[PDB]
Design a protein around this ligand. Structure first.
Ligand code: HEM
Length: 289
């Protein structure tokens, strides 16, 4: 199964920077969502969930086909709450109807991370919408109530190693859990990209509590929380070493996150040898906008 990237006809860096800017401007404007968190975190989650269906064994799923637009994937219980991100992007797509759905969803994630003062994430175009029958079945996204062994094994399907996994999980510094979406409640409600996930794991006094949905979670008196899969990163000796590294080196975390997140967004896609190189978008701030 081969998915070859194909650049939207006649489009170049300037076209994609315009789309970036439209998303970034809307992020700034629609700032009231989720008690003033804004849409940044839910867009990062959307990019991850559309990519995280990938299976290295047969090259099914992944960001290429834009299949989240189809009912089966849109209504995956693991995707509860992402409709809010989809709605955010819908007027963007109407203004730029030439962009593919996978390109839009993935670009949304890049734009959100950058606009939240995260690292630059190189991004490549050319995902092509594929038909409804290529939509992966539900159940390929991970459970939260599990341990380190589960996390490790799970991410092997996505061709991610221990360092990639720990880097990617740092995105949990963003946003929050919502009881109605996932059965977990709480979080920092933060919309600036930092390495604070690692600092919080190492520095907070964590208590194992049961929430209103009857699920266990780790809570601190500061008001932070961790999922069991989050906490597993300090229970496993290999993960713990990497957690400590990122807690003590913000730049290293940024660099590793950028590489891992691009890889996540590109899994399953074959780029022809004459495909454009990756784009690095300027932020609104860099443009003076
Ligand atoms: C074992 C892997 C993972 C599990 C079990 C997991 C689980 C969850 C759950 C249960 C929520 C709360 C959803 C809700 O209630 O609204 C959440 C939120 C989030 N996740 Fe993960 N996640 C995982 C990996 C990742 C990765 C790899 C990324 C990105 C690189 C990511 C980014 C986020 C973001 C940004 C939010 C906040 C969304 C919001 O504020 O609306 N997650 N995750």
């Amino acid at each position: 199964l081969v998915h070859v990237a194909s650049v939207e006809k006649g489009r170049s860096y300037e076209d994609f920077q315009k789309v970036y800017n439209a998303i970034a401007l809307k992020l700034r404007e629609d700032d009231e969502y989720d008690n003033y968190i804004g849409y940044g975190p839910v867009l990062v989650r959307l990019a991850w969930h559309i990519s995280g269906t990938w299976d290295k064994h047969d090259n099914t799923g992944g960001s290429y086909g834009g299949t989240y637009r189809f009912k089966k994937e849109f209504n995956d219980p693991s995707n509860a709450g992402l409709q809010n991100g989809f709605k955010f992007l819908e007027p963007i797509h109407k203004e730029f109807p030439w962009i593919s759905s996978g390109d839009l969803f993935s670009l949304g994630g890049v734009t959100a991370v950058q606009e939240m003062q995260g690292p630059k994430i190189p991004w490549r175009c050319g995902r092509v919408d594929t038909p409804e029958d290529t939509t992966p079945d539900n159940g390929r996204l991970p459970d939260a109530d599990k341990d380190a062994g589960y996390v490790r094994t799970f991410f092997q399907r996505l061709n991610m190693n221990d360092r990639e996994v720990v880097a990617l999980m740092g995105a949990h510094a963003l946003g929050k859990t919502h009881l109605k979406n996932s059965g977990y409640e709480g979080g920092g409600a933060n919309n600036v990209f930092t390495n604070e996930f690692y600092l919080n794991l190492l520095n907070e006094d964590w208590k194992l509590e049961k929430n209103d949905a009857n699920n266990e979670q780790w809570d601190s008196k500061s008001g932070y929380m961790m999922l069991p899969t989050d906490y597993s990163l300090i229970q496993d000796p290999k993960y713990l070493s990497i957690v400590k590294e990122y807690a003590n080196d913000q730049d290293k975390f940024f660099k590793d996150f950028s590489k891992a997140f691009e890889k996540l967004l590109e899994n399953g896609i074959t780029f022809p040898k004459d495909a454009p190189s990756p784009f690095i978008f300027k932020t609104l701030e860099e443009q003076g906008l």
